[PDB]
Symmetry: C3
Subunit: 328 residues, 3 copies
C-alpha cells in the first residue's frame, strides 16, 4: 500500500483510528492523513471505474444537521450510502426544536445507543463537544460555529495533494505557495486548511482588504508549525491588498466567500498565474469567481466538491470498519 | 419478451437506448420506450403481488429533491427505489429559495450530480428543472413542475388504461378508445399530458367542463395534429359537453380531475361547479358496462365515496400502479447493462 | 429450541399467529406474544452487544409517518428497521392537517399501504390511528396517539423490568413485584398502559401523586380487574402516597414521570437511601428536574438502558410481525 513513495500499514493505522471521533483537523496526525489520502484515491478510482463501492455495509448512522447545510449533509449521506451502510437523518431542525428543552448530554447518551456513529452539524460551539462527551459512539463533525470542519480541510488538502503531491514529502527544495483570497477573518475554511498546510513546507499569501485579513492567532499557529519542521522564513507569510501582486507565483488560489471588487477572479486576473496553478473554493460561490473561469483548465472547485464524496467515504471506512481494504 | 402477445420487445436493445436518458416531458418517451415501460411495469406488478424478490437494481444511490410538498408522488418514488434494492437521500419540506440559498441552480446540480447516480426532481419553477437537466452529469426524472409536465403520471395513467383496454397500442382503425375528461380541464395539467400521449393512438376525446375551465386550445391542436399523423382524426374525434349525462355516454374511460375551490372567484361559483360534475352511482348508470373511472388524486368531493364499491372505480389501482411504473422506469434508465436473464419476468 | 430460562416458546407457532398483526394498544399483545417479544428482544440485545449480524429482516420497505415531533421514538424505529437490514421512507416535521392537505385519512392509508410492507404511525389524533388501521392493506404499529396508547413504550418498559426481576413472568403468589409510579399519573399516559400490562402479573402498585394529578379511576378499575383475574388482588395491591419517603419504601421499581407545571417529587441520592438494595429507577424521558443528574452515577438508575432497550424491543416486534421466513432455524438464537 504505497502513494508512489510512502508505504502505509493501513492495518496498523486503522487499529489506531477505530472508533476515533474527528472534531478538529488537529485530531488527524501524519500517518492518519496518509491513510485518508490513500483510501480517498482508492474510492475515487473505484467510483470513476463503476466498480463496487460497498466497503462498509452493516453500519447504521444518524446525520444530525441542526442548520441547513444541504451540500455537506447530502455529501455524507452519499458517502454512507455508496459504502452500502444505512443512515437515519434529523434535518430542517434547529438547536432548540431538536433539544426541546432536553439536555444535549441526555440526547447523545440515548441516540448513541441506537446507531454505530453520528455525523453532527450544529452552529453551537459548546454542543458538539458536549455530544463527544456523552456519546458512546464516534462523532464526525460536519461543522460548528468554532469554524472546525475537518472533512472540508481533509478534502481541500486531498484536492491540493492530487495536483502537487510533493506537499507530503516535506522536502526543503519542494515548497508549495498558496494564496488565500477574500474574507480571511471570517472564512473559517481558511483557518483550518492553514493549520494543516503549515504542517508541510508551504508559503502563504493572505490577500484581503485589512478589515477582513487573516486573524493573528492563525498566523501564530502557522508560524509554530512551520518552525516545528524548520520551514519558517521572512518569505513564509506575505500579505497583499490586490490580486496582481498576490496571485504571482502561487501553485494554489483558494478563493473564499466575501459578504458586504478587487477580489473577483476573472480570466483577465488569471493571465499572470503560473502555468500549473489550480483554483479552489469551498462553495457556494456568488460573485467571487466569474462563470467564464469554469472553462479554464486552472479551475478545479467542482472537482474539489466531488472529492468530498471520496474523502468522507475514506474517513467513514477507516473509522467504522471492523476489519480486504479497497485497491486499484 | 412479449406484451399483448402481438408485440415482441428487445428489452436488451431498448435499454441500451434508454440507459442514462432523462425523462422531463412525456414527449421524451417514444413508441418502443412506452412498450418497454408497459411490459416492465406489468412484470414488477406480478412480482410484487406474488411476494417475489423485487431487487432488480441494488447498487444505485439517488437524490429525491422535492421543492414543493407532494407526499404521494415522493413516497411512490422512495418505495420504487427501495423496492428495487437501491438507496436514496431526500431533500424535502424545502422550497425553491431555501434550498438554492442564493446559490445558482446550475452550480447546485453540477455538484449534487457528482454525489449520486440519478436525481428525481419536483419543483414548481419550469425554468429550474430545465436548468438542472443542463447542469447535471446524471439522468434527471421530473416528478412535476409548473408547466404541468409529469411524465410518470402520464405513464401510470396510460398503464392503468392499457390494463383494461389493451387495444389502445394496436392503432387499429376499428378498435378505437373513447375517454371523457371531466372537471377543470384548463388547470388539470394531468389531462394535458395524458391527452398528448393518447392522441398518438386511435382515441376519441370528450372534454366535459363549464366555459371558464374548458380544455385549452393548445392541447386540442396537439391532439388534432397527432390524430391526423396516424389517420384517426374525424369531426367526431374531439367533442365538448357542459354536463355528465351527455359526456359520460359510450366512453371506455372516465378521467375525473381535481376541482380546487382556490381557482374560482368565490365559494358560490365553486359548489355550482363542484356539485354539477360530482360522480355518483346515479351518474354512472348511463356509462358502458366496461367503463373504468380514473383520478390522479387526491379526490375530495369529485367522486362520492359510495363509488369505491363500484367495480367501475380503479382510481386506487391507478395510484398503486405508480409504484410498478416508477420501478420500471428507474430499472430501464439506471441499470448498468442488460443481460437476457437479469430482466424481470413472471 | 427456545426458552426464557424456564418457559419454552413455539416461536414458529407464535409468529404464524402474529404475522401481519397491527399493534395499536398494548392489549393487542397477549401472554404468548409477550414471551415471544421478550425472548426475541434479548436475542437482539445479545447479538448487537456482541457486534454480530443483526440483519434478520431484509426485503421489507416501511413508511415512518410521524405527524408530531417525537424524534427519540422515530429515530428508535428507523434504527430498528435499518439494523434488521430493511429500508424505510419517512414523512416528518408534518402535522395532522398539512400531511392530509384536506385528503381523507382513509384514502391516504389506502394508497400508501400499496407502496410499503408495513407502516409505523405517530399522530396526536385519537381517531386517526384507528382510521388508518381500517384503511391500510398492511400492518400498522402505533408509535403513540392522544389516547395515550404506546405499546412499544409499554413493551420496552416491561422488558427493562423483566431484565432485573424475571419472576414477574412466573405469576407466583409468593414472588410479588412492587412498583412506585411517581409524579403526574393523571397525564403520564405511559403509566396507564404499563399498569394495564403489569396487572396481568402478580404486582403491587404505589401511586405517588399530589391531588390534581393522581392516577385516574378507570386505570385503578382496569388494574383491579386483571389482578382479580389471576387471584392477586388485596387491599394492599394498590396504595396511594403524597410524598416519596412513604411511597419509595420496599419497591422493586421506581418509574418516574414528567411533571410539567404548565419541587416535591424530585429523585436525589438523599431520597434513594431508604429504597431496597435491588431497586431499579425507570423514566421514559426526556427528564427535566424529575431526576437529579447525581443519580445517573447510582447503579440503581437504568433510565438510559430503558431508552436503549427500545431498539431491541422494536427490532423484536418488527421481526415477529413482518418476517415471511418459516423455518424454526431462521429466528435469532445466540
Ligand atoms: C448538494 C450540492 C449543492 C447544493 N446546493 C444547494 C443544495 C445542494 C445540495
Ligand atoms: C434522538 C435521541 C435523543 C434526542 N433528544 C432530542 C431529540 C432526540 C433524538
Amino acid at each position: 500500500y504505497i502513494n508512489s513513495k510512502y508505504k502505509i500499514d493501513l492495518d496498523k493505522i486503522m487499529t489506531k483510528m477505530k472508533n476515533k471521533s474527528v472534531i478538529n483537523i488537529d485530531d488527524v496526525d501524519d500517518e492518519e492523513l496518509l491513510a485518508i489520502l490513500y483510501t480517498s484515491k482508492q474510492f475515487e478510482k473505484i467510483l470513476k471505474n463503476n466498480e463496487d463501492s460497498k466497503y462498509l455495509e452493516n453500519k447504521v448512522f444518524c446525520s444530525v444537521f441542526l442548520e441547513p447545510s444541504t451540500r455537506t449533509r447530502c455529501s455524507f449521506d452519499a458517502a454512507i450510502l455508496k459504502l452500502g451502510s444505512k443512515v437515519l437523518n434529523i434535518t430542517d431542525m434547529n438547536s432548540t426544536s431538536f433539544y426541546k428543552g432536553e439536555t444535549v448530554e441526555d440526547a447523545f447518551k440515548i441516540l448513541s445507543t441506537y446507531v454505530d456513529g453520528i455525523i453532527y452539524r450544529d452552529p453551537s460551539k459548546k454542543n458538539v463537544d458536549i455530544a463527544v462527551s456523552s456519546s458512546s459512539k464516534p462523532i464526525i463533525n460536519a461543522g460548528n460555529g468554532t469554524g472546525e470542519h475537518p472533512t472540508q480541510s481533509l478534502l481541500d488538502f486531498y484536492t491540493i495533494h492530487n495536483y502537487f503531491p510533493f506537499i507530503l514529502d516535506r522536502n526543503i527544495n519542494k515548497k508549495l505557495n498558496i494564496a488565500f483570497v477574500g474574507d480571511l477573518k471570517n472564512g473559517r475554511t481558511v483557518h483550518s486548511l492553514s493549520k494543516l498546510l503549515s504542517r508541510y513546507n508551504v508559503s502563504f499569501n493572505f490577500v484581503s482588504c485589512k478589515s477582513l485579513n487573516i486573524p493573528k492567532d492563525i498566523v501564530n499557529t502557522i508560524t509554530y508549525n512551520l518552525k516545528k519542521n524548520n520551514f519558517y522564513s521572512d518569505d513564509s507569510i506575505k500579505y497583499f491588498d490586490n490580486l496582481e501582486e498576490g496571485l504571482e507565483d502561487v501553485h494554489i488560489i483558494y478563493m473564499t466567500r466575501i459578504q458586504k471588487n478587487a477580489f473577483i477572479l476573472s480570466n483577465k486576473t488569471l493571465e499572470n498565474t503560473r502555468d500549473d496553478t489550480k483554483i479552489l473554493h469551498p462553495l457556494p460561490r456568488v460573485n467571487e469567481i466569474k462563470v467564464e473561469v469554469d472553462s479554464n483548465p486552472k479551475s478545479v472547485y467542482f472537482t474539489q466538491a466531488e472529492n468530498g464524496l471520496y474523502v468522507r467515504m475514506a474517513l467513514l471506512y477507516l473509522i467504522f470498519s471492523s476489519t480486504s481494504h479497497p485497491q486499484f
